[PDB]
Amino acid sequence: XXXXXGRXXXXXPXXXXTXXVTXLXXXXXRXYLRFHXXXYXXXXXXX
Amino acid sequence: QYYRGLPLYEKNTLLERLKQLTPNEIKELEHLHDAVFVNTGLQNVRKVRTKKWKKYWQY
Fold it and tell me: Which residue of A4, A17, B9, B29 pairs with B14 in a disulfide if CB–CB is 3.0 to 4.6 A?
């Protein structure tokens, strides 16, 4: 019906500023250290 | 009014506008229509999913 010259345009529904736009194509119209290895009792203990 | 995203057209005024346009502008038309269709679909799924997520958080 609406198809024009081999083009299948059929599958279409047919029934501030106020600009006007064209329809169908819109455009303007833990762990804490332990004592060892912490450097005491490694220089100490006079007993 | 709108079919999916597109508004409804009238036969008489429509059959003139599409006669006006150029084959170089049909591709742009297809892509604008894809954009509007997918945008409407995403709007709908957004509504549905937000309802379901509210129910999920409540549960």
Answer: B9
Query: Chain B closest CA to A2's CA: distance in Å?
Result: 7
Residues 6+ apart with CB under 8 A from B5: B36, B37, B39, B40
Provide the experimental method for this PDB entry. Answer: cryo-EM
Residue type, A19: X
Give CA–CA dist B6/B51, Å, rounded. 26
Return residues 10-39 of A near B (CB < 8 Å). Answer: 12-15, 22-26
What does this entry list as its resolution, in Å? 2.9
